[PDB]
Amino acid sequence: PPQLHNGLDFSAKVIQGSLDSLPQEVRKFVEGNAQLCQPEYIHICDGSEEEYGRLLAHMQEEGVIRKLKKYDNCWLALTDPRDVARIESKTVIITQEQRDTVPIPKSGQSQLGRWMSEEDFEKAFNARFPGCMKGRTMYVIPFSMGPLGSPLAKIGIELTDSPYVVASMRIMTRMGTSVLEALGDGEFIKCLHSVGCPLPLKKPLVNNWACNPELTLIAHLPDRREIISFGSGYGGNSLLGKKCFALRIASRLAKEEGWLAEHMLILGITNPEGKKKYLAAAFPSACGKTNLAMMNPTLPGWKVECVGDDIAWMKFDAQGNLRAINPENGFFGVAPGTSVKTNPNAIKTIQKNTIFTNVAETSDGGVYWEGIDEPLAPGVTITSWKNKEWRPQDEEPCAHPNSRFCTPASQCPIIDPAWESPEGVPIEGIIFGGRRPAGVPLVYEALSWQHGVFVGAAMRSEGGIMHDPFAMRPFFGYNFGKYLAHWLSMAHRPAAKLPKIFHVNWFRKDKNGKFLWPGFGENSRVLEWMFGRIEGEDSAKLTPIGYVPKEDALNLKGLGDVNVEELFGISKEFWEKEVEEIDKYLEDQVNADLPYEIERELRALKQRISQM
Template identity: 85%
Template sequence: MPPQHQKRLNFSAKVVQGTLDSLPQAVREFVESSAKLCQPDQIHICDGSEEESRQLLCHMEDQGVIKRLKKYDNCWLALTDPRDVARIESKTVIITQEQRDTVPIPKSGLSQLGRWMSEEDFEKAFNARFPGCMKGRTMYVIPFSMGPLGSPLSKIGVQLTDSPYVVASMRIMTRMGTPVLEALGDGEFVKCLHSVGCPLPLNKPLVNNWACNPELTLIAHLPDRREIISFGSGYGGNSLLGKKCFALRMASRLAKEEGWLAEHMLILGITNPEGQKKYFVAAFPSACGKTNLAMMNPTLPGWKIECVGDDIAWMKFDQQGNLRAINPENGFFGVAPGTSVKTNPNAIKTIQKNTIFTNVAETSDGGVYWEGIDQPLASGIRLTSWKNKEWTPEDGKPPLEPPVLQPAGIACLSQTLSGLSSLAVVGEPCAHPNSRFCAPASQCPIIDPAWESPEGVPIEGIIFGGRRPTGVPLVYEALSWQHGVFVGAAMRSEATAAAEHKGKVIMHDPFAMRPFFGYNFGKYLAHWLSMAQRPAAKLPKIFHVNWFRKDKEGKFLWPGFGENSRVLEWMFNRINQEAGAKLTPIGYIPEEGALNLKGLRDVNVKELFDISKEFWEKEVEDIQKYLEQQVNADLPYEIEREVLALKQRISQIKDGFVLLGFSYLNHQEERMLMKHLVIRIPRKERGTLTRLIRTLTQKLNV
């Protein structure tokens, strides 16, 4: 640990479960040095057993930290201090010797791609917080595995915490306990130290019996030392150090060094009616329906979706050149508001037992409730809000019209932005917009049979997406791997300006990783680009989707929900070279008839796929400005070239011109066609000419 004076502190804590002698030497040294510093009264070495879990939950119930929800089997409710409800980007830092190792140096102003802290400043901050921070409390030792035990893609960590809530949640979200220590042996592990920052006796009373220290909250990552240090927050994103801290920030740095990828992506399997199965990963910013897509019920007859993971993917090319992915997590830590039987029936089924709810409302019969749950309250049932107050629908002052469910399955009642939200209703919500459920992944009714496969599942498609009300087509395919990396870097999405509550803005969120990069984003892009140089690498196709395009009246053009399976079907068939596509300046879009619309009514395909020169000129200008400003000297040349190429292609769009798309040609052939076959023809004759060209190319075997 940073301070060198730890050895002078007395180590008098009593070990109440397990023995220090049973720990691997490096783990024991970590525990002992941290105990000398933090001065807990007791040390509890977690074994991960059912009995241990039961005792911890009952202990927290006795302390008033959680409440049993009698309507369900082994479900619990925690209400936090209202000041401790979300991730805090401004207090989340990465410590390296050089600032440029963590973030690119922007042309001007502050970096939007991470926060760097010097080693000297961190040591001062650490020394001001941790000495004696666990007095009167128990230090829990949590050995945990990110990924299935024994998988070559998995990593092990050891978290020390004084929060039993963290222990109970980590047992759900990771593989935790004695088997992890046995698998670790003398191997390497990531050291994770967490404290709520409230030594006993307390200086001031707690709110909702929730221990936290918001004034001194700090979440720090030291990648060179493989350490994560968190102080002052009990909220999951800040205290469950296996999640974003390890699985994304630390892991992305490890992945860079070791030649793999750690990404903010869902993993799903999709099987067609003939029984052929493919796996996709998908990256979406907040409020774009990632969990809902991962657990979707497809409307297409005979098609099946299965969930491997809803949030994080670790991916590595195997010796055969296949990109293999594991879900490093063991549970779902999902946003509750907007989750309903209509938007995500499989999530609702998943959380009926063995679940910890945080900051949702409670019904008087021992159930849970939140905005967008879409379940009427039975007569006589009362609600208690997340602030532990009686709540009625009038307190929320909902609009006269019911909320419009959005295509990906997120109700418009909340838009999350960096873990924060503002409501589309006036008044006080019954559940916090960032309220959560923490449930075992094994309980998901459509969990994939291979979700714990040690070798991972083979990825054939990568999907990027965002919430774009105008301009961006429903789906398009990247022209190449390099172009696909640019598409990920250029991701933008509509989000509520939560700080000012002044309406909607389009935010840059490259790879949906903006808050989670563990190192310089320019180097991250170079790492992605380098995957194309892997020997025998079978590069997945890359796609971009937008479920949220609206017409001039503000209505969604695409129905979303299970109908999104139609888009996945087109991608599936593109990978099999069985679906036609039309080349456009931004990528391949489905040719006429290639997207299965059977049974759908009133879908304006023309507007869904319209590519406006005016829109895309501004879009590429904004993307170029952002990359040049934020990534600056670290922007790879290949990405600069993609920006310029897109600019040139957009400039060639002219009224009265048509770009003829051809199916089943390779990228080089289609680029040649795009360059030469730009033909001025009247609109009414275009269909005839297109058919003529198709016939000609077929006869010439193009």
Template identity: 60%
Template sequence: MRTASCVELTLLMLLEWRLRHGYQQKKSMIQSLMLGKVSKVFLGQWISEPEMEKEMNDRYPGCMAGRTMFVIPFSMGPIGGPISKIGVQLTDSNYVLLCMKIMTRVSPHLWETLGDNDFVKCVHSVGCPRPVKRKVMNHWPCNPERIMIAHRPEQREIMSYGSGYGGNSLLGKKCFALRIASVIARDEGWLAEHMLIMGLQNEKTGEEKFICAAFPSACGKTNLAMLEPSIPGYKVRVVGDDIAWLKFDREGTLRAINPEAGFFGVAPGTNFKTNPNAMKTFQKNSIFTNVAETADGGFFWEGMEDEVDKNMAITTWLNQKWHIGAPGKAAHPNSRFTAPASQCPIIHPDWEKPEGVPISAIIFGGRRPTGVPLVFETFSWEHGVMVGACVKSEATAAAEFKGKVIMHDPMAMRPFMGYNFGNYLQHWLNLNAKPHKVPKIFHVNWFRVDSEGSFLWPGFGDNIRVLDWVLRRCAGEQGIAEKSAIGYIPTKESFNLTNIDLKWDELFSLPKPYWLDDIRESRRFLEDQVGTDVPKTIWKEIEDQEKRIQAMTD
């Protein structure tokens, strides 16, 4: 992959237009947007500096005419913290202004701390100057035919044009906190990752451990971060539900902060059964995007059928009359809530601790309906990085893929990488050096199904049973795991199975043909997408795992 004199161009497939108008994007329009001048690869889109300058100069002049321009100084992370970074965003969207005030720490005092070049420069426009010459649907100005979201990682600059939704326009989120921050982290020796941060306190001993977990979008990060345990023994508190910045301290302990100040969560599927703490968090001071509205002024989305009167009149996200049981969807599958993290009833008291919280384990995972066991521990840091590089998941509404296809999402960072993925993997590998004390790495899969398509694992509050095993492994407890071809698997006797009936053998089975296909397909993916930039250590880990799988009995 090229890196020199290039700029990452993230083409988000006209998400804006689809979200607001139900428009089905056509491949030909994507190709025309790419202008035939963009390098099209799965892990990133790249365009030369001169071409990017030309495209931006064709868009930005006069783009905010007739609108109010807002200047937003914001901090990612606690203001003044050792891991925190500052940004300034220009925007002509009041929706962006309000969401940024929730999602980041906006303060006029930041002007007093800024130097000449020690902040990330962010410019955003909906690309719809007044007088408006196009029809604005649902009071949502945008310019879907000319959307362009670009990053200059080395210059710490973000440019967003034409979109007015989510991470396309809230530039402190994915654009800054992941794409640009990953480059800053590479240069400064830390990590910017698509991970939740949660604390688990043993109620008997009072000891607390923190974990980070990386899942693709809409795979349960928020639900896990705000988990309500189904069994006694642990108190769970959330530090962050989406992004983690991780840095080793002077003693070599890996610490993490949540650079955000709010939650930008997927609404459908969220209810008082799946995530009561999220429901309690956004009862005030919150913004809902592309959800349905009930006749009494409340909100509704798929998953709330048992919490709303069946006879309640509902207006869908497309402003159409609807009722529970009617055809179609009331809310967009990627509709969102934006809420202050401070309102979460289980927010950790140290969630804004400037130096962060110490991390004992890193967990990767995704939606894997077949073949992949509930949990396994990797053999080493290097093996864990390889497992993270090979993360796959069933596509979700937050991705540009349709249907139930298994997509690669390495490190759960596929849409969010700010530089060459091979170099990114090498950066991870380099961190395993003295005095760094790297945490253990695990992989989980809440979504395996049986032959009839039913989930083998109940998930939600019962995920505490998996985390209990993870923490006991981190503590060095012996006799609770057995070695397999892919990592250490729990013994049945070591798991807390109180009041739960499981098809244990099926949940933890490792079909040899499946795993041979999986490791070989992962090899092809890395060869195709990363090529000679894949670190030799990763190739060795893949080769070793393939040999172990080949040695398995059928």
């Protein structure tokens, strides 16, 4: 009799599964947080189809989702307009020393992370979590990041009061009983989440979407293997396996253990000769990873296949190959801009078993968003994401710009045969890229590994303004300076077969703000060039910024009107500005934690530019 009364025994409140079936430390995790959060019910997720349909029915009954009648088992959730995206300002990492998490900025304001003390977090935690799940179900999500059972997979337990989180996590991860069995008495990442709206409600509910914007806080405690998230039900704030776990926690572990957790798509590309290579590409959010990951190549005889569109875990094998796996189980893709033109393969994926968030609904029960490129029949009407009637004449979009689809990976018609291989896929090329409207040509190749890493460090998003090194600005699990040092150390691994490093720019514009490159499926012409360069073809011309394609090295047939002078042009004047800017940025944001080799590469680039 380990108790004097009932104890912390929550058995009486279990409505799915059994606490007795849980590994000991898992049970402890549940009951400790049950005591803190005070849920009315505990639901231990098994991951079955039966559970999933019952969950969707419950949410349908609760008014939390709408069935999209035009498609097969597709659903729509509409959110509070205050809870529409992963929120960087409320995202923090707790460590003993600030500098372990983020370099100390000379300006006194860091773009590379957001550190919170243990003391401050404890106060914030205590002001948020006690009784937060009152009147709600605590769902227990046992999930594997990476192929189930594999020793490279990592397991988490997410406790959440959101059924929307459960349904999405079932798509985005491998979840259920088999995960608990794979876990045994092993280590797991502790993931705690609440929408922060205990019953009875204190503030009004908008669009049946529970959230607490004012108290929204997404915290990480890597030393405790803990992710603790409050107040948002949206994407990266709530699906804790994705950014919180597979990037922030995992990059820190990767640093300690000799691997890599990165914001990268993984694709397999096959040339007309049937030769296949795998490539990894880091672009910032909103810069087109998912379009490339799922590309339909315009060039005949070329094939692209998707391993993953968002997150990559990578490490060397015994033979020196950099091996990559997608730790996700689905795609959580931006809906607006998705079309037959921009992503035909996504269009084919998302018509069954898919959850949409903040897109518009058509009167015949279908989905709509800006950039969909499909006219509707006259008479068909649109309900916006704000649940109002909508006309193309309105002063606002029918879908939120960050509206999403959530879709099973295995459903993708071009999903790669090896997308679940526990040994991972051999990466032969790493592609960096972002939005650079000026100065940066379509593609270049790095001069060396060290130059490659410098190229990643100098990536940009948002109109070529915001620095987003390695597409990881909001995702570093630790000090950026040390992350660079970790990337640089890869060149010292004996027999390491280092991938070639490229930088792309789909976004160069002319003087009128017109895109100089067609992009999307046409980016196959760029990947072809990369493929050949990996094969060691004599197709490259040396410049101050790296190797670029020679004249006529790129297949431009079918695009005879491309302004090649402007697209591939390199200006001494522009690049002088570029180095000066990178210098100020690294001085301000990285300073004492900058590895010497990065300083050297900045000097080397400046040097080559001075000889123009």
